[PDB]
């Protein structure tokens, strides 16, 4: 089958950053097969034409690091808490209380919001894969929906005895909420992840991948991380790890996590680290040396009161730094455009420098650079011949995006996230004129009421306070 | 005597006890909120019209504590990447100068369209282009028609700051084809012009329009000029406002901070609203606090222009009246209270390394009741209470991004994008309903945006400004 | 004498094993001076303080009061502090606690004493904290939120080289 997108302005993010006025894209069997300018050439015939007249075409946004299921915990229970407080009084207990049919709803809700905001690829860091039936429920929905998914199966094989007293104290804040452990033996995790990979890697028409995800340098053994590193190598994928997200996660064995990893030969080009807030000049240098990929969760770092990562420092060194929305419930939106705006501003403010990151650069982080940070830049991230047809159409014909001249500036500094109109993933039309293929408008309101209801019930089961009393101070 | 009933909504009152009233109603008459009740306990009065707010959240209209409207036509490429003075002299002044009155009218309608769409009902317009002939008239006609509540803070400059000349000339060399402009005026001329403007327009459009004097800054205005403004505000029971310490080149007037300087001349009082408190120290905060000075924080813009981060939590923890302003239409670059609230919440959490430095409730208060306080208008607006004006907004949380929702303040601040506002009432008048704008109907919307686009492009040609600079990654 | 007195009876029901090595070193400065412990079992302290209160609270013509005084967040159990908090509430008096007077004190369980107290619901309007030298913006905010009362020992904070609150 074939698809022709016509009369659009193509923001290619290609090698030369070409922006092509009144131009077309020809799509076939999920691939971009040709591009042209309408004034200079005629588009090939195609089964279907999408008229993009007066519209902007981008590569699909890439959510470099996120956590999907937790989305059902937003809306009151999740805010106001430092990382570990949030983790132990909200995230773990809340996830535990979730049944597979709840997970299926979470995933569809997440995807609905993501696609609406132009997101076509999702790096799902899955902390609830340990619970039976959850994987199957989730994968069914990811497949149906048509999104491109990296499923990074997290594991924990090591107790951090150092932070026990801290956690017990934190638990006392909500002593009605259970203290949970999702630890598992090293060999069990290997088996479970290998099985998951064998079964689901490459499925849904190449749209689903599986990676190993040792949780952190303090919650995973050296043997565990080495296994993940080797696994990634052997299977031509990536491995990923949360690195230094709180000041209690700071020093492992008298050194930084990056230092510790360097000691054990654990920093390589197939590693994607997330959360670089507690980083120093040396840590950056180490990651740079080994071509480590990065995902910056800028909004979440603020939400959880962690701080501000040295993104400009990394970007200035040509490192592959993508943007991640992080948890559905540490943001609390799944909106790349809103997060791009935030990435642009937070760094300008802190560096007291209005040009520390150009909107072009922010846009690159969300697309081509993000693809790079997933090791997927040969397949996605730009409008180029040979690459997958992961494409999005923006309509700037709205008050907030008027006027518009410079497209990157307009998207980063003006757009709210509701201006995406049509979304293609792997050549499939997943959204058209804001009508979602996997959640049609006649079914939308009922679905949101189901999600609301299930969320409420999840919180009851977990004994979590949904709506705390009005508090000004 | 005509009446309006809003029914079956959840009322987020921001009243004295912060009441949140499930399945409740509001009765409106002659622009005023005349009663409230809970549906289970009482029956709403009969009314000429009923608005069903079933499954919806009712808030006091958002208050934009400090903004600049006309500049909105300069967004979209020309305005970003520049420190405050660079932006000011290479973009704002020349761009504004190139604007004709018909251009201004379009700018104001575009601004208002976006503002009302995002739940903004009251706007503190700091007008730097009021010096040009025909501009005031054009703008006021539109503000009036549109039905928004407006404070028109007429800015003036009566003093050259000779210290900063060489700096500005160097900045101008960045865009040398763009003209260096001056909007300075003699103290007495400014007084006359502002007094005339006040006499003519204060209280017009059914009480919706006010006029304040706005000495630009402590370095661009004489003591005589600031004292006049201070006295004027007092005599006419309004406020006066001043931009204070927005860049590191301002941070010291005559060997002291602007706040210190103002203190020396008895220029800090309860009718003053200062904007931009980035370059503030402990002592400055203390001085403002002592005199009950009102504040407007332009958090997004302070970031956009690379100024930095103001000590908002410090001021709020002292019970000071701090409102939220979007600032310039072209130093944000949106007119979206909800997006800016989110940013206020996050930037301060990040910088203070403290997830609870400002509750979402508190952020929401800044946007509503506290904002009203910062405009000296908290007796008239900012909360859903009997006696106050019917400036009200209806939010629909039945969208993916705002699902689930339990705690309404958290949901609005951390989840909402700004497109969830449905119906907007200003002074009892229906200004927007199911996202249909009364002053810009959908059948006329696209053509209007194309007009705004064109005019913008033309304005930039006339000013010799680069609209779309070459792609730049570093 | 006729003076008005609040008699805040201090108690310690918990060993802080983390700083023994540091204390042994300090003791070597004056080795002929004996190392002392005034620790007591939680229940013993309760009894002793309750008895003291029953006997002396309101005496000398209303001039004498008695409060419970858990020594610090590191030298007192959560159970001990909760008791003192409850006791103050039940008998319409206050309870008091030394908080963060040296740099060896200012973490308890990976957080500030005020943070730790907040976790256990231990900051209230009947609490009077003493010694706020090692305090940050957040600690101040927490105390403010709960209307905690404060006593500043400015001269002493200097004398002992602690610093400035
Ligand atoms: Fe994470
Ligand atoms: Fe301003």
Numbering used by the authors:
A (entry chain C): 2 to 474
B (entry chain D): 1 to 474
C (entry chain A): 146 to 310
Please give the exact wording used by the authors of the publication that reports this structure.
Atrazine chlorohydrolase (AtzA) was discovered and purified in the early 1990s from soil that had been exposed to the widely used herbicide atrazine. It was subsequently found that this enzyme catalyzes the first and necessary step in the breakdown of atrazine by the soil organism Pseudomonas sp. strain ADP. While AtzA is a hexamer that contains one essential Fe2+ per monomer, TrzN (which is ∼25% identical to AtzA) is a dimer that has a single Zn2+ bound in each active site. Although it has taken 20 years, a crystal structure of the full hexameric form of AtzA has now been obtained.
Two full hexamers (over 600 kDa) were found in the asymmetric unit of the crystal structure in space group P22121, whereas a single hexamer was found in space group P212121. The two structures are essentially identical (r.m.s.d. of 0.3 Å), with the higher resolution data giving greater clarity in amino-acid positions and having significantly more water molecules added to the model. The hexamer was confirmed by DLS and size-exclusion chromatography (SEC), consistent with previous reports for the solution state of the protein. The ‘cavity’ in the hexamer is approximately 14 Å across at the entrance, with one residue in particular, Arg163, forming much of the surface of this entrance. Interestingly, four of the amino-acid changes conferred by these mutations (Ala170Thr, Met256Ile, Pro258Thr and Tyr261Ser) are located in the interface responsible for coordinating the AtzA hexamer. The substrate-binding pocket and catalytic centre of each monomer is accessible via a long hydrophobic channel. Although the conformations of the metal-coordinating side chains found in the active site are indicative of an octahedral complex (as would be expected for Fe2+ binding), the geometry is distorted from that predicted by gas-phase electronic structure calculations. The substrate-binding pocket of AtzA appears to be ill-adapted for binding atrazine, with strained conformers of key amino residues, a low-affinity metal-binding site and a high probability of unproductive substrate binding.
